[PDB]
From a paper:
[name] is a giant, elastic, sarcomeric protein with a molecular weight of more than 3800 kD. [name] consists primarily of two types of protein domains: fibronectin type III ([name]) domains and immunoglobulin (Ig) domains (ca 100 residues in length) that account for over 90% of its mass. Despite the repetitive composition of [name], a single main immunogenic region ([name]) has so far been identified in its chain that elicits the reactivity of almost all known anti-[name] antibodies in MG patients. This 30 kD segment, also termed MGT30, consists of a domain triplet of composition Ig-[name]-[name] located in the [name] segment at the junction of the I- and A-bands (I/A) and corresponding to domains 4 to 6 in this region of the chain, i.e., tandem [name]-[name] also termed I/A4-I/A6,.
To gain an insight into the possible molecular determinants of [name] recognition by anti-[name] antibodies, we elucidated the 3D-structure of the isolated [name] domain, the double tandem [name]-[name] and the full-length [name] region [name]-[name] using X-ray crystallography. [name] is joined to the preceding Ig through a short two-residue linker sequence, residues AM, with the relative orientation of both domains being fixed by two interdomain salt bridges. C-terminally, [name] is joined to the subsequent domain by a flexible three residue long, hydrophilic linker, STA. No direct contacts exist between [name] and [name], so that the linker sequence acts as an effective hinge permitting the free repositioning of both domains. Accordingly, the structures of [name]-[name] and [name]-[name] show a different mutual arrangement of these domains. Since the crystal structures of [name] domain tandems and isolated [name] show that the structure of [name] is not affected by flanking domains, the apparent reduced binding could be simply due to the specific methodology used. The 3D structure of the [name] [name] will help future studies on the pathomechamisms acting in [name]-based autoimmunity and should also improve diagnostics for [name] antibodies as an important biomarker for thymoma and MG severity diagnosis.
Numbering used by the authors: 0 to 297
């Protein structure tokens, strides 16, 4: 008398879902007289015990354990039971998922009195599972606990409300899976609602045209950073060659142009401009070359 090997795979009809690094455990009830021999294969490769691969056989079952699990362990595992009657083979499709990576290119902007707009980009790896959403958290730089602003955000942007003036905030955004949230992405610098205004930046492109014995016409470019306050005007200054004293030309003007006059013929002058706002005056622009006051010739 004898009996064929039989295996019970009814526990894997849906499949096997494993979150890294939890072990992949496949226990299959086996029957058969004589007792069948177990053979484990991952893909077209025969598995044998060693490090992460561990196998055991009892009279009632054959079991395969892969610990710790990796993403590369995903595939179809095959169990062959063999006695003198017959050789049977069954397959188990194992999906090994993990948690998402961190959102990319987290930026902040559009800072109002009570809101901060945040935009990000999808993470590189979703962890072998569809992204369920994004998680938005905040924390004032004085406080030590992160509070969740919103979860399951299905967009690449979010406007954080209910922010208080005079406070600095940190922001981090995570990506979510069925396994849970992943590594967070933080903001490059803290976000400050207050932002006390500063003095402007120097003008940038001071150039000259229409140079005579007593006059010159100067043009410059407005600075990029106004310092948080409106550019009230500009101040043009002058330095003769034989001195290191910068003298102001005329009076403050609201335009990016000025015609300096009163120049003495035969002298060489350099010129520089400052940008004015409520907080004061900027640092002077890069001074121009020393230009001789003389009328055109030939």
């Amino acid at each position: 008398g004898a009996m064929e090997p039989t295996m019970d795979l009814s526990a894997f009809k849906d499949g096997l879902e494993v979150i890294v690094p939890n072990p992949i455990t496949t226990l299959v009830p086996s029957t058969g007289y004589p007792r069948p021999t177990a053979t484990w294969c991952f893909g077209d490769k025969v598995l044998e015990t060693g490090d992460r691969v561990k196998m055991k056989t009892l009279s009632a079952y054959a079991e395969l354990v892969i610990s710790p699990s990796e993403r590369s362990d995903k595939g179809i595992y095959t169990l062959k039971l063999e006695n003198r009657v017959k050789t049977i083979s069954g397959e188990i499709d194992v999906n090994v998922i993990a948690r998402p990576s961190a959102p990319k290119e987290l930026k902040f902007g559009d800072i109002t009195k009570d809101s901060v707009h945040l935009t990000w980009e999808p993470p590189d790896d979703d962890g072998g599972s569809p992204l369920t959403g994004y998680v938005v958290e905040k924390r004032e730089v004085s406080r030590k606990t992160w509070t969740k602003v919103m979860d399951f955000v299905t967009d690449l942007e979010f406007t954080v409300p209910d922010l208080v003036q005079g406070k600095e905030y940190l922001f981090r955004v995570c990506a979510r899976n069925k396994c849970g949230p992943g590594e967070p992405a933080y903001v490059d610098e803290p976000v400050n609602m207050s932002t006390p205004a500063t003095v402007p930046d120097p003008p940038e492109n001071v150039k000259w045209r229409d140079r005579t014995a007593n006059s010159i016409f100067l043009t410059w470019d407005p600075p990029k950073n106004d310092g948080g306050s409106r550019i009230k005007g500009y101040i043009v200054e002058r330095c003769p060659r034989g001195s290191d004293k910068w003298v102001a030309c005329g009076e403050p003007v609201a335009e990016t142009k000025m015609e300096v006059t009163g120049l003495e013929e035969g002298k060489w002058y350099a010129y520089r401009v400052k940008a004015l706002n409520r907080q004061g005056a900027s640092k002077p622009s890069r001074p121009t070359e020393e230009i001789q006051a003389v009328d055109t010739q030939e």
